[PDB]
Design a protein around this ligand. Structure first.
Ligand SMILES: [Mg+2]
Ligand SMILES: [Mg+2]
Ligand SMILES: [Mg+2]
Ligand SMILES: [Mg+2]
Lengths: 690, 697
């Protein structure tokens, strides 16, 4: 029947990846030289891939035993599964990118034109997207099937240390943590590497060991960007389930010495299962979206192509979900009490809002960052007033650039909660992040294309024309993408804060009104302090990474797989450090000061991290595109040399660590710190010191 | 009471200023060139003061009228009183400064350095004593007249006005006063701050070309602006103490057998209202003693040592006298238990102590990260050899990190404050921090006086040996100002957070009366409205910061053009345009709670206030320390401390560009945020009277 059919969807996603893999490999490369440059970058990634995975492993071990001891073994098992699922995606995506690039450039010559070359480049990228979708959903299907149904977890426990939680809630929290861990290293570690290289490269003006930087371009927006969305994706689904699950013990009435589950088992179990099926449809829609664009007759405009896949995947998801939402939950009862203002159909509306939020947030990120529209143009043209001015105007731009996307978030959240309550916020995150496969594909297109262009550069002009066109679009979709990935990061984290608070329900809270158990009071000094602490930590976090990039860059600068191994090792050492902050802060503050304080910290972290991620992303991209702006020739009389170009160079170099390392790291911070807190609040709620 | 004795302290503060004014006035200026230069900057300042004064009035009236219609006539008067009181202080401090500089400078030559410090410090203190004297005088007026005479401290039940708008009479009244101080503070910062840096830019975008415009700027920022800023936080802390106390009366009521029982009784409330006033009075008295000793003292060779003695003297004194004051005034009270007073009577003195020390620590943190004297700036400086790119990124890195230690200090200070004396303890901690604001502001005001004295030497070219003393005075001005700036940010955050507590207390409705406090003293972060609010408030704080960068440069260019159009073929021109382009930020500051409030209600604005304070606190620290560090890194090389030879060399050029980026950040963006996180709270405390019930969606 219809059940398992849906549950094999991640498999189909995976097979499609597995197919796209096949169809890419059979494409050729021209000449010994196209191959020779290619081998440099492909080997570079694995070397880099080796040390980190190995580093990850050591960390992954320590965390797993701990979850099993302090929570339950399922939770510990689930965690490794999530880590493996995300891990796997990265291993696959990196391998693909560094081989697909060449066959684009050659496409730009073998097939001899740009439309059949876009079809190549895009096919590679989709492997990363479908694997991200396929793995993430496959894992959750496994955990659901094995631990949820068979072991009866879907059928409120307190464990051998007296730590209490709803088993499955706790279980998926581990799974979420796993994805988080692989994302953090990929971002806070790989992010340091990529920009250390870019800096280093931009610090030796004469064939330099740029190859490091070239793998970086892949490392960052394929693996890093990809892992971010997966986590937010998983973050959105997990958060929907956690809030749902705890609603069961929360909503009980005491009726004459009986306990009456005012939200009954049937209702809870569906609201739990619902986001998974939603996500399957999302994954399904992207497959239809992906294939259509793939099979289509080629175009001259690859931007239009890429865009067809998103919209197709998104229209599709909006539609089936309404049926999905309507028929499912159709006769459920108590949805009123659950927070469903318009009954059965309510959460579909939330998903739509998230979807539309996502698209808008993308436009805003682009708007403030792309010359073609006003903000970046002015920055660019302000270069004529000096280096001071370029820097000042770029800071001013980004600080302002924060308001429209955040306002977009504000209105979306406001409307989200009207439709489906706190649950609606989490479902919004999921809708936002539905079609994630296609979303990640368009992100991944950028590096696949960029090296291809580079690969043309290292070895015609007619060929370079196609090459240059592909890249222009890559860089845009990458900028839209970050902006979208940040939007989703904020929404996930907000869901995860909600998750943190639901997860605090105690046996000893049972009875009392929702308004008395779902509460973090800001008038409480601990919560205010918490918020300030988390905010300071987020700025510190951001600060450390800037200095980290230059440290590592410099480590490279003093002098091709060895130079990569050297800085990669140094890169890892300096990943640990942020990670203590990221991982232990809930633990440290929790065991010191308790659940209220940590609630503060999470809020500070999210608020400050949301603002700073956006600021750095847009101003950093602006500075780059401002550099681009003058280089295409637009200030008239100024071009590729001259004091304004220098000032723009200086601005881009300030910008380069900020947009591609700091901001994207902050995405992970505001999430993982929440996920961790969701898990550890099991313990430090009761056992805290003061 | 014994109390009238206390109530004439503000008069003396003013008289003490007035005398110090006289004794400075009677000091001389040297050369005709020395006199001519003094008049230049002094006249320059006056042109600017007129237009600003004229603008506040136009704006202050409308707000006064508005308050009178919607709240009470009393509230509007009090507001104007507050507006007048802070204004006056700024008007007085500026008048003093632009005459005092020379007579510092002349001391550096006619007598010979110790008697030059003795000159310089006397001028500064007029501003500090006026800031203390006025602000508390105003408050004394509001307390005596509106509180006692009109009986609001006699009643202090829950009132309902001619529009059916409800509030606790005295609470509402003093809220207007705080708002009064805020409006003259906002203008002085968001207007004078843009001007100051529009000038600095303009001057550094070309002796004596447009330097004079910049030289008046130097006074505007750290005398008038800084003095008004600290004044507001000072008043903000006291007003918050009063607001929390007043509303505590209706909160701690229990319905018993259909009776209403005030668990915290009238006697306690009236005392808790009066207590923070007396505290601030004791502080000022202590600060005057702190002030008098250092002036009269045998001179030193170390002007730092002089200045620091005044601070320490004022603060020790305040700790001591307060503890007698605190114990004895609350000696035999009742219901302090229910109030949150963990140790009965003595409790708030401990909070004040926490605040004092927090204040002092926060000062230290600002110095550490900003002075080439310590390590963070040393590294930055040395990184100059690697290029302009490195300097900017490293300077950014420095300030982002620099946020943690003062904030941690703030975290620990709040935590302890609330343990001792509850939410009330947080505000008293704010008050204690600022309890010796008079001596603090003097050292702040000391700063511009010295800088100009130094500059005056360069234009006049009076000796090198004389110039040696002059340069020394200035170096220390710039330092104590960074400590000073640092302290005012610390205190702004503690005040703003207290004003947030006030905002929530001010929300009790007749229909909340009865129910447990813990159900009424509530802002639920799980509520989406509050979350959205917080995000919105956070983004708005970033916008505000971003706008001001663009505002300064816009204005700057307009100044640059005023040089270019006068010299190819003043002062007022760039100052007015600076003003014109201020309303807009000021619109953001003042109307945002109203708009979002009438749109979305008390929860959303609650969110906004938290976001605003959180974001503003963080960005404030970053910009102050980084901008100062960037400044001090260039200096570091200017005193010759690399090996790169220095001075027009390639690393130096890179540090200059960083300093040009930094200056609007440390002196305009950051200091405006101090004001933003406060006034937005004050506005909210007042307007939550209305949009709590009357909101749209
Ligand atoms: Mg690059
Ligand atoms: Mg670049
Ligand atoms: Mg100076
Ligand atoms: Mg300067």
């Amino acid at each position: 029947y219809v059940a398992a059919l849906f549950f094999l969807i991640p498999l189909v996603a995976l097979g499609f990846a597995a197919a796209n893999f096949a169809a890419v490999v059979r494409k050729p490369e021209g000449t010994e030289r196209m191959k020779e440059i290619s081998s440099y970058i492909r080997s570079g990634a694995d070397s880099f891939l080796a040390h980190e995975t190995k580093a990850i492993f050591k960390v992954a071990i320590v965390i797993a035993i701990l979850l099993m001891i302090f929570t339950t073994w399922q939770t510990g098992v689930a965690f490794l599964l999530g880590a493996v699922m995300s891990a796997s995606a990265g291993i696959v995506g990196m391998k693909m990118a560094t081989r697909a690039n060449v066959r684009v450039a050659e496409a730009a010559r073998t097939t001899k034109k740009i439309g059949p070359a876009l079809k190549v480049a895009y096919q590679g990228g989709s492997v990363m997207g479908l694997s991200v979708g396929g793995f993430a959903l496959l894992g959750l299907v496994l955990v659901y099937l094995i631990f949820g149904k068979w072991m009866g977890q879907v059928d409120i426990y307190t464990n051998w240390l007296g730590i209490n939680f709803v088993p499955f809630a706790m279980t998926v929290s581990g799974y979420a943590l796993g994805c988080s861990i692989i994302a953090m290293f990929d971002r806070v570690g790989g992010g340091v590497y990529t920009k250390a290289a870019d800096m280093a490269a931009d610090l030796v003006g004469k064939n330099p060991a740029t190859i490091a930087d070239n793998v970086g371009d892949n490392v960052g927006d394929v693996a890093g960007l990809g892992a971010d969305l997966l986590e937010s994706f998983v973050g959105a689904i997990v958060s929907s389930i956690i809030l749902a699950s705890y609603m069961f013990p929360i909503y009980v009435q005491k009726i004459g010495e009986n306990l009456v589950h005012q939200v009954p088992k049937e209702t809870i179990q569906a609201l739990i299962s619902y986001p998974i099926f939603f996500a399957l449809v999302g994954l399904g829609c992207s497959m239809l979206g992906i294939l259509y664009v793939i099979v289509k007759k080629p175009s001259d405009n690859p931007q239009r192509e890429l865009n067809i896949s998103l919209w197709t995947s998104a229209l599709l998801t909006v539609v089936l979900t309404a049926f999905l939402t309507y028929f499912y939950l159709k006769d459920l009862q108590g949805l009123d009490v659950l927070g469903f203002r318009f009954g059965a159909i309510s959460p579909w509306f939330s998903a739509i809002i998230g979807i539309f939020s996502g698209i808008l947030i993308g436009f805003w990120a682009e708007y403030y960052t792309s010359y073609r529209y006003k903000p970046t143009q002015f920055l660019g043209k302000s270069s004529i007033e000096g280096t001071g001015m370029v820097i000042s105007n770029g800071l001013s731009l980004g600080m302002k650039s924060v308001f429209p996307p955040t306002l977009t978030l504000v209105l979306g959240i406001l409307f989200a909660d009207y439709f489906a309550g706190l649950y609606g916020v989490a479902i919004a995150a999921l809708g936002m992040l539905s079609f994630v496969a296609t979303s990640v594909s368009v992100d991944s297109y950028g590096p696949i294309a960029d090296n291809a262009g580079g690969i043309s550069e290292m070895c015609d002009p007619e060929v370079r024309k196609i090459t240059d066109h592909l890249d222009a679009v890559g860089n845009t979709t990458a900028a839209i993408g970050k902006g979208f990935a940040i939007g989703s990061a904020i929404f996930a984290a907000l869901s995860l804060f909600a998750s943190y608070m639901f997860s605090q329900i105690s046996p000893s809270d049972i009875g009392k009104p929702p308004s008395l158990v779902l509460l973090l009071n800001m008038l409480d000094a601990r919560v205010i302090a918490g918020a300030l602490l988390g905010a300071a930590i987020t700025y510190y976090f951001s600060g450390y990474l800037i200095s980290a990039v230059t440290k590592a860059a410099m480590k490279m600068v003093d002098e091709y797989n060895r130079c990569i191994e050297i800085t990669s090792d140094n890169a890892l050492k300096q990943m640990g450090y942020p990670a203590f902050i990221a991982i232990l802060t809930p633990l440290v503050t929790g065991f010191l000061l308790g659940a209220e304080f940590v609630g503060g910290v999470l809020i500070g972290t999210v608020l400050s991290g949301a603002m700073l991620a956006i600021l750095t992303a847009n101003s950093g991209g602006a500075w780059d595109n401002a550099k681009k702006y003058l280089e295409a020739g637009n200030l008239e009389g100024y071009g590729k040399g001259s004091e304004p170009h220098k000032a723009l160079v200086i601005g881009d170099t300030v910008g380069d660590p900020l947009k591609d390392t700091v901001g994207p790291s902050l995405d992970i911070l505001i999430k993982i710190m929440s996920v961790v807190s969701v898990i550890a609040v099991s313990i430090f709620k009761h056992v805290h010191l003061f």
